[PDB]
């Protein structure tokens, strides 16, 4: 359209929509983080792990940034990295205990 | 300041919200990709058997790099599987500890 009377309000409406759009994305991301966070906390409570291990994992999960999605992503990165480290540590102990018992270990599917 | 000049000002504002909006998505996609690569290299620096690492990498480079909402869900999935595996290994750990007549603590 070309009439000033039509373009201006039309563009105004368009601007209000981009804003509503932008806000929706953020909200949806902050909402996705909230659900993800609670979901992992409940799944964790479902494990047979010792209270001390759970406490330490829940702490890092509960601390994920809930407002900035970019920081949420690095906080998730740090969580995964810490889990991998702990798993690694425990695995070595597992190995030593295996030999100690004259046992063996292998990998399979479930 | 004429009525007609209101039009160029809005368009400029429209473009901004569009760029900012396109940027937001670009940074998220690059962040996902960067932390995906980052983690995969961290995993290689561990002593975990090749199978365990291969198994974890498979799940990592499996993360959705386009849609952030799905990236988040795959991240949760990766995290859930790590927790479950840790839980299983810990249980095998207490079981072996109890046969070697040893004890564990923190």
């Amino acid at each position: 359209m070309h009439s000033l009377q039509n373009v201006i309000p039309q563009q105004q409406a368009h601007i209000a929509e981009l804003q509503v759009y932008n806000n929706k994305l953020e909200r949806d991301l902050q909402n996705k983080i909230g659900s993800l966070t609670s979901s992992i906390e409940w799944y964790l409570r479902s494990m047979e792990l010792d209270p001390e291990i759970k406490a330490d994992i829940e702490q890092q999960i509960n601390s994920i940034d809930a407002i900035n999605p970019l920081h949420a992503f690095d906080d998730l990165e740090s969580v995964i990295r810490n889990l991998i480290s702990d798993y690694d540590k425990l695995f070595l102990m597992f190995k030593g205990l295996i030999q100690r018992s004259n046992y063996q270990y292998s990998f399979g599917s479930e | 300041h004429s009525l007609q000049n209101v039009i160029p000002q809005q368009q400029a504002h429209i473009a901004e919200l569009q760029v900012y909006n396109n940027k937001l998505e670009r940074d998220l996609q690059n962040k996902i990709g960067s932390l995906t690569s980052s983690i995969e290299w961290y995993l290689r620096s561990m002593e975990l058997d090749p199978e365990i690492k291969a198994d974890i990498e498979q799940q990592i480079n499996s993360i959705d790099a386009i849609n952030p909402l799905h990236a988040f869900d795959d991240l949760e999935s990766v995290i859930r599987n790590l927790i479950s595996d840790y839980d299983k290994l810990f249980l095998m750990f207490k079981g072996l500890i109890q046969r070697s007549n040893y004890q564990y603590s923190f």
């Binding site: 597992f94 063996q104 270990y105 292998s106 990998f107 | 199978e51 290994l89 046969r99």
Partner: peptide, 27 residues
């Protein structure tokens, strides 16, 4: 494609390579 997970399994080379994973997890 195929719903599954890779797992760690404990074998007893003296029982012929018998899988004692469950037996040991129930301590």
């Amino acid at each position: 494609p195929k719903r599954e997970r890779k797992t760690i399994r404990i074998r007893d080379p003296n029982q012929g390579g018998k899988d004692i994973t469950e037996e040991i997890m129930s301590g």
